Structures are given as C-alpha cells and as structure tokens.
Amino acid sequence: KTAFSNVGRKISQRVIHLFDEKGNDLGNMHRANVIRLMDERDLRLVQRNTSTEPAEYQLMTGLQILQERQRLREMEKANPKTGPTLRKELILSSNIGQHDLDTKTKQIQQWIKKKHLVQITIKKGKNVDVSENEMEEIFHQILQTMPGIATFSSRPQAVQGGKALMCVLRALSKNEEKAYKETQETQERDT
RNA sequence: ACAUUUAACUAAAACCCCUACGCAUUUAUAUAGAGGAGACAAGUCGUAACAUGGUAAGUGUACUGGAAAGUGCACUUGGACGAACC
Numbered sequence A: 001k002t003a004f005s006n007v008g009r010k011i012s013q014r015v016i017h018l019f020d021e022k023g024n025d026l027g028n029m030h031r032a033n034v035i036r037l038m039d040e041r042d043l044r045l046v047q048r049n050t051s052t053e054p055a056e057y058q059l060m061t062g063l064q065i066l067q068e069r070q071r072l073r074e075m076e077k078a079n080p081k082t083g084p085t086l087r088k089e090l091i092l093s094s095n096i097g098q099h100d101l102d103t104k105t106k107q108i109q110q111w112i113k114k115k116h117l118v119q120i121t122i123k124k125g126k127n128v129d130v131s132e133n134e135m136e137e138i139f140h141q142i143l144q145t146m147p148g149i150a151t152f153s154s155r156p157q158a159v160q161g162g163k164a165l166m167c168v169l170r171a172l173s174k175n176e177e178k179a180y181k182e183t184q185e186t187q188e189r190d191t
Numbered sequence B: 001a002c003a004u005u006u007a008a009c010u011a012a013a014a015c016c017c018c019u020a021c022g023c024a025u026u027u028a029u030a031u032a033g034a035g036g037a038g039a040c041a042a043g044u045c046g047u048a049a050c051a052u053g054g055u056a057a058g059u060g061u062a063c064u065g066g067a068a069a070g071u072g073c074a075c076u077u078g079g080a081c082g083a084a085c086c
C-alpha cells in the first residue's frame, strides 16, 4: 500500500520537483534546499505523483494532509475500486475417488462465486494407465455441476511434457450470464 | 344359588346346581426401511498422533468443519524450559 503521509526529512532522490502549499509550481531543486524550505515555513513534504520522471513532491501542513487523506477514503467508500483476481490452483489425479472429487468440486464452486480464477491440473494416477481423452472428461464433469456459473478461461491443454492436462475456469461475465438466461428462457418457451 | 322328603310289627328308600376366555393379557418370532461394530484388505483425500511430530499432548464441555480434526474456557503432565554466578 502507498499511504498519503509526510515523507519526512530524508528524501529518496537528489533532484526534486517541488510545489507550493497553495499549488504554485516551484520547479526542480535539490533535496538540501527542500529541507531548508520545510524548516523555514514549518511544513511537511508529501509525494503527489511518482510516475513522472522528475519526482513530484508538495509541501503541506498537517491539516492539509488530513483533509486529503480524508478525501481519498471517501472516494473509495463511494466508488470502491475492484481488486486483482486471485488465482486458485488444484492438482487432481486421474483415479481420484468420487467422494474426493465431489469435495473439490464444491470447493471450485465457492471460488467461482468469489470471482476467482481456478487453475485445474490433472495428472496421471499412480500405477494407472490413462488416456488424455479420459483425463479431459473430468474437466467436463466438474464444469457440468456449474451449468451457467462457470466457463473455460483456458481450455484443456497438455502440459508438463504431455503427462498432465491443465485448464483455467472463470465466472461467466454479466453479458454471458444474461445470454445463458436468454437461451434458457427460449428453450422454456419452446417446451 | 340349592334347602330333609318318605318311612319306621326286623328296617330302609330317596338325594346328582349354574356361571369363564377376551377388539383381554404375557412373551417371542417374522417382515418395509434405517444404522452400528467387526473381519478381510490397504484404493481415494489429506497428514491428526508418535521427535518440542514441525501449533507440546490430553481431559471435560461448547460451537464449527470433506476427513482426520480446529477453536474457546477451566483442568492434567502421562511435555519441556538447557538446572552456581554469568
């Protein structure tokens, strides 16, 4: 996390693009001169933008820093930003028992409702001879319990030297969800 | 409920009742279906226990969880704390 607080007296860069407490642009100056300004006016230094090639810092009072920090949290409370998608992994065996496959199927369903990406890998069972067409059937068994909830983000694909398959499931988008409801309703009208 | 009659110059005859047992009661067997334990064995998912077993273990109780189990509170040592001062 990047907090909006006083940077302190030790500045990271040597050349600093400084601004005034009222927003007036003071141009670039050496950090030694900035510390002198902070002491002469009794102000604190905050970092407004870092993407710019010349580091942009601004002088502010303790009251301004509070007002900005309050403004930012209200912007998020009102317009909360979405977080990055978390990737969950599962490694199954070809000869996985049905009771255990049901346990992991219920777990995959809970990850999809939370809008996660589920990477499912299927390896050849121990002391078992299996074909890639039979291992690929487990994916459809898993995804069949989630008719209009999940779909393939990355279809089954041999990996690890052809020993194991791998796919990535995701939650259906809102447009894809309304389409499923539409197609389902059409079948209801036909039947 | 039933109630002793005849007979008696030797003495004898006569006497014969009706109500219970059931859709009651006792115990057991059979049978739809639902569970438990054990044996055989060691597939499947984990790795709970045994070493400070990788969060010391356990008891009671409560709640919770695919599964061993997890967690709270009190209790136990059937754990330990390295055994002069440093």
Ligand SMILES: [K+]
Pocket (backbone or CB within 6 Å): none
């Ligand atoms: K334990």
Ligand SMILES: [K+]
Pocket (backbone or CB within 6 Å): B056, B057
């Ligand atoms: K122990």
Ligand SMILES: [K+]
Pocket (backbone or CB within 6 Å): none
């Ligand atoms: K207990």
Ligand SMILES: [Mg+2]
Pocket (backbone or CB within 6 Å): B047, B048, B053
């Ligand atoms: Mg263990």
Ligand SMILES: [Mg+2]
Pocket (backbone or CB within 6 Å): none
């Ligand atoms: Mg332990």
Ligand SMILES: [Mg+2]
Pocket (backbone or CB within 6 Å): none
């Ligand atoms: Mg305990």
Ligand SMILES: [Mg+2]
Pocket (backbone or CB within 6 Å): B064, B070, B071
């Ligand atoms: Mg818990």
